[PDB]
Amino acid sequence: MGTNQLDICFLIDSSGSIGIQNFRLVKQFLHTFLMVLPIGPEEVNNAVVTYSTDVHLQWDLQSPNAVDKQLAAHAVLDMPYKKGSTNTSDGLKACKQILFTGSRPGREHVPKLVIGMTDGESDSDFRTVRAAKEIRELGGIVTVLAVG
Amino acid sequence: GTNQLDICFLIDSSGSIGIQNFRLVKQFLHTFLMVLPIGPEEVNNAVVTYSTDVHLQWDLQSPNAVDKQLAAHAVLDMPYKKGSTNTSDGLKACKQILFTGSRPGREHVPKLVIGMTDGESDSDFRTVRAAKEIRELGGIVTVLAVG
């Protein structure tokens, strides 16, 4: 395991709970976070999934966006707001599939992180649902950021 | 559990960076602290700054480690301290904090070093012994280029 090596699945609430204005803030924050991360083929790989009624893969770990900071940071700004129900558990299962079956070759020693991004209001599903515990059992690290 | 992490923030305060860029780092760190699920049962944080010498701001035993508002306000006040770049001793300090100085019993929880620099000087974070030792303890070392 090297310095600056992480596979991160960002799981971004785009649901009716959140509201466009808060969702725009999230995208702003995520853009800034991606700009400061050391993103690259041998360093941080990023995937981005938004969730509401269904899950919407933006890109997985095999995407060119996953290893190019300018591609990823530009792309996150234009993710559309979806406004439906809040299917956290399926969101988490989509990250779990990307992290544990979809990483790039040579990353077995690389930590697997879910970074949730929400309100802060009703994101208890992250601490609670079976899909979160499974990722942790696989050795994944699940954290939720509340951009408010 | 979800949200359970020990983070040692290691902030470059060297002359290399400048007071302008130092205040920017402090502002990015304030926001980053505000969004993190900091609490006694969740994310615990410690902050150390470094130039020629390492300046402990707080360890994981401090009330600032478990209180989002405490930590965020304290980071803003942190003094610029022009100097050289003692990354090795910075990382030794984070190592001591993370692996001997957690609250009970967070001995099992993920341990992270998050460095904040001016986008440059991230080579030492890869190569020095202190970094390697962290990684071999299972600690995760990631440098943010706030710049």
Give a structural overview.
- The structure is a homodimer.
- With 148 residues, the first copy, chain A, is an alpha/beta fold.
- Chain A has a single domain (1-148), classed as von Willebrand factor, type A domain (Rossmann fold).
- Helices cover 34% and strands 23% of the residues of chain A.
- Chain A is built from 5 helices and 5 strands; from the N terminus they run βαββααβααβ.
- The first copy, chain A, has helices spanning 20-36, 69-76, 88-101, 125-128, 130-137; strands spanning 6-13, 44-51, 55-59, 112-118, 141-146.
- Chain A has a 5-stranded mixed β-sheet.
- The longest helix of chain A has 17 residues, at 20-36.
- Chain A is globular.
- The termini of chain A are far apart.
- The relative contact order of chain A is 0.22.
- The interface between A and B is medium-sized, with 24 and 23 residues.
- The PDB classes it as hydrolase.
- Keywords: microneme, MIC2, A/I domain, cell adhesion, hydrolase.
